[PDB]
């Protein structure tokens, strides 16, 4: 499942 810290600017909210 996608890494939320791969790009912190992407907030999965």
């Amino acid at each position, epitope marked *: *499942n996608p890494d939320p*810290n*791969a*790009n*912190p600017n*992407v907030d*999965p909210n």
Partner: antibody
Amino acid sequence: QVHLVQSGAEVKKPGASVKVSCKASGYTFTRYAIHWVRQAPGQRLEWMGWIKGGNGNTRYSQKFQDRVTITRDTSASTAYMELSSLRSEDTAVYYCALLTVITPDDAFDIWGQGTMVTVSS
Amino acid sequence: DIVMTQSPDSLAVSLGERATINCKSSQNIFFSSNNKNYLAWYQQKPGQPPKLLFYWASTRESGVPDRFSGSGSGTDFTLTISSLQAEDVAVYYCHQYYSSPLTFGGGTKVEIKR
């Protein structure tokens, strides 16, 4: 207007280091993370690492971990990136960027104008 | 590590015609929870920083012309320019933000055909 201006070009010899600045403005600097992406001449974009503006947490690419160092100066709202042990193959335009800032509401994406780093003897 | 392969390396299509850039990811970059592909399409003209055209594969960044189209899901993606202008002559990069390291495609050189 959110602007990322970054330092002028640098010419270094192999084995030297370079520190490339990224001054942020037009937004609240401690909120978002600045990424560092380099692009060799005629080559694809290569992501190097990011740092959170207020926290200072870093994540490096595995290709550069041992030479790269991204830092924060909340006082100056500026991001720095230090690539050590330079190599001719590090000759590239180095970008700092607020990559794909996707917040619940509006989305935006902003890059610095480019720092041409030339590594040669 | 997630390899982004773009096809073709270079296409030449005439003014007002259709341009299709293909992009394939080494790994499926679709999150089933939020139903979103973690893909990004960038446009870069010579000597300038890249410009985000599409995020979430299809969601269009504010200010991008409606002739640009982002499509695809999972591993196969497509950037479509319905009627090419001379302003669209650039290198187009697909970009995944699904896992680290963030990777970009090799780029696709779009040129005017005459």
